[PDB]
Design an enzyme around this catalytic site. Structure first.
Site, short mmCIF file in Angstrom:
data_model
loop_
_atom_site.label_atom_id
_atom_site.label_comp_id
_atom_site.label_asym_id
_atom_site.label_seq_id
_atom_site.Cartn_x
_atom_site.Cartn_y
_atom_site.Cartn_z
N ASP A 55 41.42 74.73 43.55
CA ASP A 55 40.67 74.37 44.76
C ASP A 55 40.31 75.58 45.65
O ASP A 55 39.82 75.41 46.75
CB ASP A 55 41.42 73.26 45.54
CG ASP A 55 42.79 73.70 46.03
OD1 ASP A 55 43.01 74.92 46.14
OD2 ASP A 55 43.63 72.85 46.35
N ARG A 83 37.98 77.38 50.27
CA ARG A 83 38.84 76.23 50.00
C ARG A 83 37.96 74.98 49.90
O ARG A 83 37.11 74.74 50.75
CB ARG A 83 39.91 76.11 51.11
CG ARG A 83 40.87 74.90 50.99
CD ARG A 83 41.71 74.89 49.68
NE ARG A 83 42.85 73.94 49.70
CZ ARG A 83 42.78 72.65 49.33
NH1 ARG A 83 41.62 72.09 48.98
NH2 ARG A 83 43.88 71.89 49.35
N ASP A 141 42.80 68.19 46.81
CA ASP A 141 43.98 69.02 46.61
C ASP A 141 44.38 69.05 45.14
O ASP A 141 44.87 68.06 44.59
CB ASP A 141 45.15 68.51 47.46
CG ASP A 141 46.36 69.42 47.38
OD1 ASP A 141 46.26 70.58 47.83
OD2 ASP A 141 47.41 68.97 46.87
N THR A 142 44.17 70.20 44.50
CA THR A 142 44.72 70.46 43.18
C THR A 142 46.19 70.85 43.27
O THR A 142 46.67 71.27 44.32
CB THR A 142 43.95 71.56 42.44
OG1 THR A 142 43.86 72.72 43.28
CG2 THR A 142 42.55 71.09 42.09
N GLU A 150 49.30 73.40 42.65
CA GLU A 150 49.45 74.84 42.56
C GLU A 150 49.61 75.18 41.08
O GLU A 150 49.96 74.30 40.26
CB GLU A 150 50.63 75.34 43.38
CG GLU A 150 50.62 74.89 44.85
CD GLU A 150 49.43 75.43 45.65
OE1 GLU A 150 49.05 76.59 45.42
OE2 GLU A 150 48.87 74.67 46.50
N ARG A 180 39.81 80.78 55.51
CA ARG A 180 39.06 80.37 54.31
C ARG A 180 37.89 79.46 54.64
O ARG A 180 38.05 78.52 55.38
CB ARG A 180 39.92 79.59 53.34
CG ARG A 180 41.21 80.21 52.89
CD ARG A 180 42.14 79.08 53.09
NE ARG A 180 42.88 78.80 51.92
CZ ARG A 180 43.66 77.75 51.75
NH1 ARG A 180 43.77 76.79 52.67
NH2 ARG A 180 44.33 77.66 50.62
C1 LIG Z 1 41.52 71.36 52.66
C2 LIG Z 1 41.92 71.84 54.04
C3 LIG Z 1 43.09 72.54 54.19
N1 LIG Z 1 43.46 72.96 55.41
C4 LIG Z 1 44.72 73.71 55.56
C5 LIG Z 1 45.86 72.76 55.89
C6 LIG Z 1 46.98 73.67 55.42
O1 LIG Z 1 48.26 73.06 55.37
P1 LIG Z 1 49.52 73.94 55.83
O2 LIG Z 1 49.40 73.97 57.33
O3 LIG Z 1 50.60 73.11 55.22
O4 LIG Z 1 49.32 75.29 55.22
C7 LIG Z 1 46.52 74.30 54.12
C8 LIG Z 1 46.83 73.57 52.80
O5 LIG Z 1 45.93 74.04 51.79
P2 LIG Z 1 46.37 74.53 50.31
O6 LIG Z 1 46.41 73.26 49.51
O7 LIG Z 1 45.32 75.51 49.87
O8 LIG Z 1 47.73 75.15 50.51
O9 LIG Z 1 45.11 74.30 54.32
C9 LIG Z 1 42.66 72.69 56.56
O10 LIG Z 1 42.98 73.08 57.68
N2 LIG Z 1 41.53 72.01 56.46
C10 LIG Z 1 41.13 71.56 55.27
O11 LIG Z 1 40.08 70.92 55.24
CA LIG Z 2 46.33 73.04 46.57
#
Ligand SMILES: Cc1cn([C@H]2C[C@@H](OP(=O)(O)O)[C@@H](COP(=O)(O)O)O2)c(=O)[nH]c1=O
Ligand SMILES: [Ca+2]
Length: 129
Positions: free
Chosen positions: A15, A29, A34-35, A37, A75
């Site tokens: 993702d 992103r 959500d894929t 890890e 991102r």
């Molecule tokens: C997909 C997405 C993720 N995020 C943030 C939330 C984050 O959680 P955290 O506060 O737990 O890090 C993180 C999770 O993404 P990843 O799945 O890439 O880790 O990305 C956003 O703020 N907006 C979004 O639209």
């Molecule tokens: Ca992920």
């Protein structure tokens, strides 16, 4: 919602992808998905699926939503298209991503992705066992 041009720099995982966007490298992103890890089950398969999709594509395009464009880790939050096929939808359709992180009002596309996940779950694909 409108698409902008972008060039593959590097595939990263299921993702996230690095793209050259308005002349600058940026980590993107995928919205609404959500894929796993890479170290999780179906992680390598998610990464692999997105890698092939963005790498095999002649034209990549990016699409922001009505809300946040850049997340707290810097991102770019986008729907991403590979020759007009949305990676976000595609992963969900193959059961390699879950619909996730749906915030209002950044979810233009939620219904279409949940439509895709229904079908993937029905089909018991990949993460749906
Ligand atoms: C997909 C997405 C993720 N995020 C943030 C939330 C984050 O959680 P955290 O506060 O737990 O890090 C993180 C999770 O993404 P990843 O799945 O890439 O880790 O990305 C956003 O703020 N907006 C979004 O639209
Ligand atoms: Ca992920």
């Amino acid at each position: 919602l409108h698409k902008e041009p972008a060039t593959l720099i590097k595939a990263i995982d299921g993702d996230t992808v690095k793209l050259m966007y308005k002349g600058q490298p940026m980590t993107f992103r995928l919205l609404l998905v959500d894929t796993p890890e890479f170290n999780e089950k179906y992680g390598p398969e998610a990464s692999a699926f997105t890698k092939k999709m963005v790498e095999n594509a002649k034209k990549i395009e990016v699409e922001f939503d009505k809300g946040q464009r850049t997340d707290k880790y810097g991102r770019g939050l986008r729907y991403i298209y590979a020759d007009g096929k949305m990676v976000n939808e595609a992963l969900v359709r193959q059961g390699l991503a879950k619909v996730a992180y749906v915030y209002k009002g950044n979810n233009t596309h939620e219904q279409l992705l949940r439509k895709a996940e229904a079908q993937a779950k029905k089909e018991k694909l990949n993460i749906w066992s």
